[PDB]
């Protein structure tokens, strides 16, 4: 599906993807390059499993917190803007997408959750979470409720959990300590206990989700919701008379939203990196590109200084920014998805009554500390199943140092092997690889989507079943069942 000459773009379903697709059409009009914007379910979960397959996007949009994990797994291409372009965006938005000294994406916009409230039902929103049980009593008498927001995603409940001292990873001396997790300390427990009590006393329901909360507020059934800038569009349509303001305090301390930077990363496996850079820098990251997206669904405070000086007059933006300053910029470290999943499970189990607050958070604490497992990155000397198309044939990835010069010339448009002989590793996925087939000795250039890692257990399973009835592939599989240790790759290149 991904192929040279075209762009496939993924962005989340709550973002202004029709607006983004209008920028895509402008790009297609001027350049002839087709742009397809998609918004699949669970895209932040899917990207790592399909980035190296034919089903990956060239460009992925998400909050920066997922991008450290992607980069550690080699899925993101390094971004290389000159000083002039960097000067166009705020420094702190670049740092959000800096990973191990490298720029790993283009920042787009800054997102924080705010308290949104119906100015008709409630001209004086509570400054404190504590006021809300009594406020809901009063509103229940009038056929309404005080507050509804998405309880299925920890993003929305984290500000309350963090208010009295909950945190993700301890930050000191400019680095995150991954073994110091603040998920089950007395503060986090206090905040999640408050949430569960709101449920128990019937002021909120445990299965309220994004669209339930959205419909409810937009129809005037609830005085308040908690949401981001992307949601202001549908409230405008509603003609609910609404304000956007600072989240309530908990035990006198501000709610502390995790702040996100919507960012666009480029798939390291993509053959369209230069096109992707042209689209992002020259079409999206301009006043008119960003405006088209923002008029579909508000971006928040954009990273682009020129367009932001316009947007910054909006009091809804100022409120976002105030909440952002009371919260934390999310870490981009690879441990973040394990943290999010751990806390997601904890909140859903506690709110539903399926587990206590103490036991839910204690399990989340240990889970959030699990060692991060990066996706493997195709390396030279790796043993693969390679498709000439052409049927899949066992082969070895050849390092550039060993590639016969004639074969180099046909290339598409350190691992220490020996004290003197070292192979530069692949830092990321590549758009093309030079492999050499076993018991065949021919070379080919392949895309990653046409390679699959081949283990020895893979070989046996093949050499044990009905697949062995295909005789021509037996010596191939049985050379590769040896593993890369059992093959002198210098010999294999030199003499077959
Ligand atoms: O709830 C966990 C989730 O939080 C954040 O996801 C946000 C995203 O940043 C926003 O742009 C918006 O779309 O809502 C999402 C939550 O529904 C993290 O970015 C994400 O990694 C995390 O899993």
Author numbering: 2 to 391, 393 to 415, 465 to 547
Question: What did the study's authors say about this model?
Answer:
The Isw1b chromatin-remodeling complex is specifically recruited to gene bodies to help retain pre-existing histones during transcription by RNA polymerase II. Recruitment is dependent on H3K36 methylation and the Isw1b subunit Ioc4, which contains an N-terminal PWWP domain. The Ioc4-PWWP domain preferentially binds H3K36me3-containing nucleosomes.
In order to further our understanding of the Ioc4 PWWP domain we solved the crystal structure of the Ioc4 PWWP domain at 2.3 Å. Analysis of the structure showed a high degree of structural conservation overall when compared to other PWWP domains. In common with other PWWP domains the Ioc4 PWWP domain contains a highly conserved, antiparallel, five-stranded β-barrel at its N-terminus. The α-helical composition at the C-terminus of the domain is also maintained, although the number and precise spatial relationship to the rest of the domain can vary in individual PWWP domains. A unique feature of the Ioc4 PWWP domain is the presence of an exceptionally long insertion motif (aa 27–110). Close analysis of the Ioc4 PWWP domain crystal structure revealed the presence of one acidic and two basic patches. Residues K149 and K150 are in close contact with the DNA sugar phosphate backbone which explains why their replacement completely abrogates DNA and nucleosome binding. While the stretch of negatively charged residues within the insertion motif is not resolved in the crystal structure, it seems likely that it interacts with the positively charged histone tails and thereby provides further stabilization of the interaction.
